[PDB]
Amino acid sequence: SMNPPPPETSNPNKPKRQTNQLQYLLRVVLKTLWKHQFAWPFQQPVDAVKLNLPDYYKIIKTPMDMGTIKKRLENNYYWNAQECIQDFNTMFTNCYIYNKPGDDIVLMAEALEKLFLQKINELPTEE
């Protein structure tokens, strides 16, 4: 009960589109970060029970993780690339809010974010 319902990965009344940029976000950006040695804490919603983080969802009220983003991309949840990019940024931002600079989890987020930005820098112009 300490864990909230996970963020939705489908929403039938939400509008969505498929674009070459969203395809790139799944095939390149998500794939790259997913396979990284530092991906594992971010591959699923924070489990405040398993990880003994009872304060986590008192502090982080807009949770996000790459497991959710992966399913959202696979399920064509997004209207555009910016919506997806926002989810990645929410995930990083949450980490920096909850944890202390220089913590192991923050070092991992920072490495992933660096890679993220490198991949985003090559995002193709739309169509």
Ligand SMILES: COc1ccc(Br)cc1S(=O)(=O)Nc1cccc(N2CCCC2=O)c1
């Ligand atoms: C002592 O616990 C750890 C130490 C270092 C690492 Br790396 C991971 C863990 S953990 O995954 O067992 N627990 C843990 C603790 C604090 C923050 C986060 N997370 C996960 C993603 C977002 C976020 O804030 C998880």
